[PDB]
Symmetry: D2
Subunit: 398 residues, 4 copies
């Protein structure tokens, strides 16, 4: 019984996190971990409203989380339809910020009444940037030159690509800092965000490189040159994951009636807030109003890694006068580094798979690998554009 397992565990031997190994059932393991934790709290009843029952923990234990004590429910709203590339999407948004889903929905409506939005994927490739060290800068220079010859690259590419069917080493960007050499490996990864896959490829590639340069020390599989989950100019300038651009034209009438403002007022706010304002703040990649809000809500709803909102949110929002009389609104959003996937990680869980299915991009695209992930990136870029339209109209109106 629980009372029995509790005193057996209190007898040090087994730690609270070794409950999924002993106890013959997931949910009970959680209940037992909770009771044990409750007694260590200044308020033993604090867990009362934290849910944990009837959740499919089979897919979570040993793949997505440890020392599980329940789950956190995030309200999921829906914005749409989003008319993108001649299709209609109903976008799931997990958030606790009031008016976010509503304002984004309004943005979607303005786009719909404007004939829809168009998007293009400009680049696709997840990255990993390890740091290695040579005895001297002259040696690291030699390695860089070697990696730059067609023969050196081919050897590394072969080693990298042997690790998986989706591992296709695209290019290599190397940077030297004295005797240190940072190597940025880039590769597609089917419909997976590709972090783990690229890591495996990187470890195999660095090993092959160690044979030709035995004096090379592999300091860290990640030397922050990726760059993963930290702001960096490199992701903005060279891209990371999926680089996407979206656009739409909003008829003056729609700007007037749906957005409650004018094209001229929107343009003036965009230039002075999103361009000049971000410039005065010393921003690198943050030339937008609130891309992070949309990226985050969709990421949580679709099982993405929410911490990747850091670089995935990079965006430059542009607005221009358009049309016969210059009263129509041209708008574009360019996002160079959307880190996303429809396979693996949190996308392996059922509730998040439901939101992905809702968009028609769940799991692998069997006939065209990577297409589901690309479609999801396009959807994110389009929804961000709807979000930018709506919030900017509100700011422009006062």
């Amino acid at each position: 019984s629980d009372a029995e397992i509790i005193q057996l565990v209190n007898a040090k031997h087994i730690p609270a996190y070794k409950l999924e190994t002993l106890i013959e059932t997931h949910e009970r393991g959680v209940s037992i971990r909770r009771q044990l934790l409750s007694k260590k709290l200044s308020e033993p009843s604090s867990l009362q409203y934290l849910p944990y029952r009837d959740y499919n923990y089979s897919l979570v234990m040993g793949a997505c989380c440890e020392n599980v004590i329940g789950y956190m429910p995030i309200p999921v709203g829906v914005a749409g339809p989003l008319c993108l590339d001649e299709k209609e999407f109903q976008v799931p948004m997990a958030t606790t910020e009031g008016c976010l889903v509503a304002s984004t929905n309004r943005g979607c409506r303005a786009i719909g009444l404007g004939g829809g939005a168009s998007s293009r994927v400009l680049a696709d490739g997840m990255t990993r940037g390890p740091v290695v060290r040579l005895p001297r800068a002259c040696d690291s220079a030699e390695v860089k030159a070697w990696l730059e010859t067609s023969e050196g690259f081919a050897v590394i590419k072969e080693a990298f690509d042997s690790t998986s069917r989706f591992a296709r080493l695209q290019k290599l960007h190397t940077s030297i800092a004295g005797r240190n050499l940072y190597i940025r490996f880039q590769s597609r990864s089917g419909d997976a965000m590709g972090m783990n896959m690229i890591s495996k490829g990187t470890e195999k590639a660095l090993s092959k490189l160690h044979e030709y340069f035995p004096e090379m020390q592999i300091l860290a599989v990640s030397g922050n040159y990726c760059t993963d989950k930290k702001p960096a100019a490199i992701n903005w300038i060279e891209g990371r994951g999926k680089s996407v651009v979206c656009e739409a034209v909003i008829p003056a009438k729609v700007v007037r009636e749906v957005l409650k403002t004018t094209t001229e007022a929107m343009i003036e706010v965009n230039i002075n807030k999103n361009l000049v304002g971000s410039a005065m703040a010393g921003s690198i990649g943050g030339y937008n109003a609130h891309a992070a809000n949309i990226v985050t809500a969709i990421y949580i709803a679709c099982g993405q890694d929410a911490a990747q909102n850091v670089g995935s949110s990079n965006c430059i929002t542009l607005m221009e006068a358009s049309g016969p009389t210059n009263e129509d609104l041209y708008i574009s959003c360019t996002m160079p580094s959307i880190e996303i996937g429809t396979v693996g990680g949190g996308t392996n869980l059922l509730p998040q798979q439901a939101c992905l299915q809702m968009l028609g991009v769940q799991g692998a695209c069997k006939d065209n690998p990577g297409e589901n992930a690309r479609q999801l990136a396009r959807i994110v870029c389009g929804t961000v554009m709807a979000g930018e339209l709506s919030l900017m109209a509100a700011l422009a109106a006062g």
Copy 2:
């Protein structure tokens, strides 16, 4: 399935759907038409379900038994259910002579485990110490004057003791927690960006600062009638976008944390040496981030910890953008210089224990678990400050663990 003329009373499921499609009523008004909250949701799902390519795609999206009462008109719209995020626990975290059991909402494997290991190394080292260096949420509107000479005049005016006092009075009249601290202004030709900074009790303070800013700008307008208020936010805050200003001047809570890990613990718990950790920290977190052209990203993975705690505690997760700013430093310490000194400095943790998502019960549970839920009666803001310290300490545990693993390499 009764006809529409009869259905105008106060009925059946298929009938509401037929009344919705017929009288063209937007799905978002379902909360004001049906009896429960859960049924408004169920109908919305049913309406939504026909507009899909896979009508059964919502099958596993939970929606039943959720307390929508607190969500409606406050946290979300067009609700079709909720998304469960697994919550793990890392700890105890020995911080400032207390012990914390940190809730972490995540779907990334080994994150909670590695962070837990980091907590253990710290506990064995005698614990961590933290300090709140600054506290003040900001809002940075952009106004325009006819000429740069006029915007310069406004800037100078805002810089006199009398001008500031007038603005501070106007700003502070809007709320009991609104305490205008300072003003940072920047000019770009005829544009003037004004960064208002103020404490806000235990609330993250976005809404309170906006109200204060609107009252202050209105007052400023009385002194300079030719001033045009272009946007209540001119990106000079800066909210949810990377910016050097948050890194250099801070935003929300600026915090520093530190600990010393005995060589023995580095060896046995972290599976490496102090010397290897230091070498990885310098060449990855300092030199690597420098080569990548990073502003404020001199850390290994602060964003992972900040995000997991933010989701579990009802914070605004989109604020992970600036809240994640962190510089992690490591150095040789002790008699033989073999013990590991580690510090994490986070200038812009945007956080709160009142309002927004913290008004929901499940997230209040995670906040209670930390002992920082809601307002602090006897010392306003203390709960939010305590939460920021906890976030900074957990990030440091996360940095310790991940760096040890990278240092041990293979």
Copy 3:
């Protein structure tokens, strides 16, 4: 003694020898023997130059001087005055294009400028045993009493040294302190350093465990790009503006207001954004800043931060066909006394502008006037080059 005699004595200068010009001749001969082209030095000038002002103040191991052509652009109609701007450069068409920009402004009724802030900085890095201690020092530095004592100590070092504010930043047990102060008409580097050393010494008396790691911890920030100079300013922060009549844009600049605006937005704002620029939202401020700095005896290496600029353009007037233009430069590091401004030729260029030496009546006014002149000339430079790009 001959020259080959003194040379032989050195093997087996201005201190030993009597003449200044002779000591240079000797050094040139001594150095001549180590080069693989000893004749190369024949075209490097050295005679008829008074090394008196240079020795022990501006340069060492002097082997001559480098002549930089000085051109003149103007008149520059700024704040109801007219300036003839000296520009030392070797880049063809720079002076000419800048002159054209000046003409467009003159025809537009002139330019207006304002100095928004004035204060040179020095940002030393100190260390405490623990982050908790550095936090304590920061808190103390932010109290009115703590600032008062540091200020008293800083200001006691010179008549001009006046401490304005303190910006402190923590990195674990490290504490970076940015001292900002006016400095009369001097660029103020040396003066601020003296003040900083006296202030840190005083701070040490309150916190004996504090280690002064370096008088400069790169938090100033001097001669390296940094967001801190852009956001908080350094030296003189200046804004300049003008309106160019549609006719002038058409006839002098050979383009239209609409084309200029479109180039400014997509080049200076969007382009600089795509490039990941911090403070480089302009076309070529560095060209003007550098040419004037060399001609006026400023420290040319300071072109790094001094060049920070955001150039803005918009439609103005009744029919919205006139060109409104502004340039905002947050960190112009400049001076009219000390350093290279102590030399006669550079003093001539400063006199040409009417800002040489100290402004006895109001210290700092000459330096402020020079900063305004630099900002206005940059604006003329931006107008001209942008017109050329908008046209083709």
Copy 4:
């Protein structure tokens, strides 16, 4: 003083009379007169009357200078020249050679401190350097009607075929115009294209601008709807701080290194290896990080770059990006008491042919280094050698100044 309508054959005051009468612009004095120095003397006299103190130009030299090289090439409305003291630091032991480095500056102790740095390196066995990349850039901004079109152009430019045709049109403009990679970036319907190419021993601006013009003209044939907004869209990026130059390089990317024996650090630099390291990490790495620097992880590279640039006829305004540098220091040797130091400079914009290097005095400083003009047999080698020299001198400068800060 003869009458105006007589003089067309005359004195100084006669030229003045004519100019002030017909409102003939001062820059015309070059074509108007027959000589050069007299055109300068007349411009000064004319200018002197437009000054609040007509005696201003008294100490600004103009006599005995070679204006033939300047006129129509380096400067306009010339009123004289500005003398910048030139000091010498060295020998600089770099790659088994010895260099005597010319430095034009007015900052006291700069040459001296740099000289000390050179001595510490010499006594340490010298420094080694490598050129990692070479390629000047120009980054124009073009516009298409829609983002979908600009994306099509980007994709087209990325094919081996599309590139070849671009490389052709670009290369056909010069002997040295040899186009390497293309880096494109999209911002909605805007497309920024960064052309990168070697340029022999020339810094490369004009050369690459020409290639870019012909490449864009070529691209306009495949895309008639493409509008060339500006030959430079700030994506180069030239003379403005930018992360792109730091990350992708511009001009010459160079790395330099040396090891300084503990004894030398102690006796010449007056400090210890341990103190130097501690200052480097907390000033050049952490300090620059706290300041929000992009590419400024050094103590004073700009000082050395500027002094050498002025002395060698380089474009001094290029000190903005050319100064980018990350200075690194670490414990080395058996006893781990020796000082390892490296400086990495990704974007040194330099040349030994063209611009100010066409003038004699600056050619003297270039000859002093043995890199003047074109390298007949190995094009670009002189410019590369100059970049290595700059990187090595910066390293000497960093060593010396850091030692002084460490000692206190």
